[PDB]
UniProtKB/Swiss-Prot annotation, chain A:
Induction: (Microbial infection) Expression increases when incubated with M.tuberculosis or its lipoprotein LpqH; induction is TLR2-dependent (at protein level). Nuclear receptor that binds peroxisome proliferators such as hypolipidemic drugs and fatty acids. Once activated by a ligand, the nuclear receptor binds to DNA specific PPAR response elements (PPRE) and modulates the transcription of its target genes, such as acyl-CoA oxidase. It therefore controls the peroxisomal beta-oxidation pathway of fatty acids. Key regulator of adipocyte differentiation and glucose homeostasis. ARF6 acts as a key regulator of the tissue-specific adipocyte P2 (aP2) enhancer. (Microbial infection) Upon treatment with M.tuberculosis or its lipoprotein LpqH, phosphorylation of MAPK p38 and IL-6 production are modulated, probably via this protein. Residues 4-258 form the NR LBD domain. This is Peroxisome proliferator-activated receptor gamma. A motif (9aaTAD) lies at residues 250-258. It comes from the Eukaryota. PDPK1 activates its transcriptional activity independently of its kinase activity. Changing R73H: In colon cancer; sporadic; somatic mutation; partial loss of ligand-binding. Interacts with FOXO1 (acetylated form). Heterodimer with other nuclear receptors, such as RXRA. The heterodimer with the retinoic acid receptor RXRA is called adipocyte-specific transcription factor ARF6. Interacts with NCOA6 coactivator, leading to a strong increase in transcription of target genes. Interacts with coactivator PPARBP, leading to a mild increase in transcription of target genes. Interacts with NOCA7 in a ligand-inducible manner. Interacts with NCOA1 and NCOA2 LXXLL motifs. Interacts with ASXL1, ASXL2, DNTTIP2, FAM120B, MAP2K1/MEK1, NR0B2, PDPK1, PRDM16, PRMT2 and TGFB1I1. It comes from Homo sapiens. It is linked to Defects in PPARG can lead to type 2 insulin-resistant diabetes and hyptertension. PPARG mutations may be associated with colon cancer.
Length: 259, 258
């Protein structure tokens, strides 16, 4: 019934708000000016990290230091997504191996999605919106690091034209997690039953929240196409970096072994 | 914190412990105490049964066994690292401090969780498919025999507390989040997390062992015995390393011991 779907939408929105540091609503206010430190070149990076816990010297080259800052922030997001997943109705009741599998194969798609909340066409928010690193600075990093950053902005600009808000994104993120086609799942049926409920709720939410945005539901599901592919391209970009170039303390490499 | 937050944290950490560590104490105790047909381990107690064990479960035997321990210890480090990431606040810390905490914490945790696999007569191996007797390990030559036995000496005492996995999940989280590790940059955010974990441990032990008086203090005192056993272990491993050439250390362990 509608009430159950709206109750589920509100449940997920409230947990979404508690799980993530910077919401899209707050991020947009920063990006539009409605005041962060701007990193637009090398000198302003040095000042920005002398006046950001991901790009502090622990690798001396700047492009490497920014690249690992991306990894180290992605590890934080994984734990934030993991906590959020526990709030999705039915999730903690799934087989424990399947919970791990769902999170393992989903965090990459979800981090891409949620990164778009922090991006516009000119750059990206960092350190809870306290900093803003320009697209041009990231795109102009040397060797493959510059071509590693730009595809994220390319996706975000297109994803952002849907103009989803946080209440829409809370259900969408839950739909991605509850994907019954992840390899190695042991009991697909209850995962698909939950996702079917989340899809009903997302569908009703987009009708109520975007009544004049025709077939928005379909277009969001199509962005599942854009997401599986770029995560595919993303892993193959990492592999080229790993064989060509990065040394970290073996313990450090263990913390990041998944990203 | 309020009780409900203390209990919610204990449940979180237990869930994650189960996801992170393939062989729980609950399963280890089922194997060790037996009474079953399907879970029965093959028992390695001498040279011939080790050979038969490696057919259903080359260097000198003591080196082979040491490499056995070394290989599991690296896997354990990997499992502990994964578990640490799930502790609320740990990944948000300064990354040098994350390294520093794992660096000094893993050995104390390995000893703790090794006890789960031990009784006074031996230790489970190959994910519980095998059991290697204490006497066999202790009779290995040169320095390798006395290198094995102190682990059993601690475990017999630690196991007298009768902790279960839900207790141990919080206890090993307290160990990791120790503010007195050398070289830490930001002691205060680590201590705030530990105080939360210590509160959680205290309530967990009172609810789970309500007839066990001062179990909390006794467990914290065991975090003393661990500081010493880890000291003796590394001082034995260094001496072993500069007398035995037939051992390389895994690069992960080599960097931890530096
Ligand atoms: C702005 C900040 O980055 C993020 C912040 C957040 C957040 O706050 O929610 C989420 C993601 C990134 C970020 N990940 N990422 C990756 O490569 C990546 C991705 Cl998409 C998915 C999974 C794993 C990874 C990997 F493991 F490989 F890291 C980026 C690539 C380019 C850009 Cl511009 C941002 C990201 C940051 C910190 C430090 C320097 C620069 C930018
Ligand atoms: C039962 C199995 O050993 C462990 C299994 C596990 C596990 O499954 O969680 C964790 C630890 C050991 C184990 N490490 N270890 C060491 O010396 C050691 C330690 Cl504690 C910490 C860091 C580095 C090392 C070193 F590098 F030096 F190796 C042992 C010494 C004696 C005993 Cl009886 C067990 C261990 C095993 C496998 C194969 C043959 C015999 C025993």
């Amino acid at each position: 019934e509608s009430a159950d779907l709206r109750a589920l939408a509100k449940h997920l929105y409230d947990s979404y708000i508690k799980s993530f540091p910077l919401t899209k609503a707050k991020a947009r206010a920063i990006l539009t000016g409605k005041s962060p430190f701007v990193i637009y070149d090398m000198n302003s990076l040095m000042m920005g990290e002398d006046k950001f816990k991901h790009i502090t010297p622990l690798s001396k080259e700047v492009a490497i230091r920014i690249f690992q800052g991306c990894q180290f922030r992605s590890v934080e997001a994984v734990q934030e997504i993991t906590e959020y997943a526990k709030s999705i109705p039915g999730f903690v009741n799934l087989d424990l191996n399947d919970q791990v599998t769902l999170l393992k194969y989903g965090v990459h798609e979800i981090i891409y999605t949620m990164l778009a909340s922090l991006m516009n066409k000119d750059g990206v928010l960092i350190s809870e919106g306290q900093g803003f690193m320009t697209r041009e600075f990231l795109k102009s990093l040397r060797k493959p690091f510059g071509d590693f950053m730009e595809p994220k902005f390319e996706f975000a600009v297109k994803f952002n034209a849907l103009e989803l808000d946080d209440s829409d994104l809370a259900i969408f993120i839950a739909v991605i997690i509850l994907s019954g086609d992840r390899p190695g799942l042991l009991n697909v049926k209850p995962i698909e039953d939950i996702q079917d409920n989340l899809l009903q709720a997302l569908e009703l939410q987009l009708k109520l929240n975007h009544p004049e945005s025709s077939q928005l539901f379909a277009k969001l599901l199509q962005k599942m196409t854009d997401l599986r592919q770029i995560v595919t391209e993303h892993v193959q970009l990492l592999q080229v970096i790993k064989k060509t170039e990065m040394s970290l303390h073996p313990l450090l490499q263990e913390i990041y072994k998944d990203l």
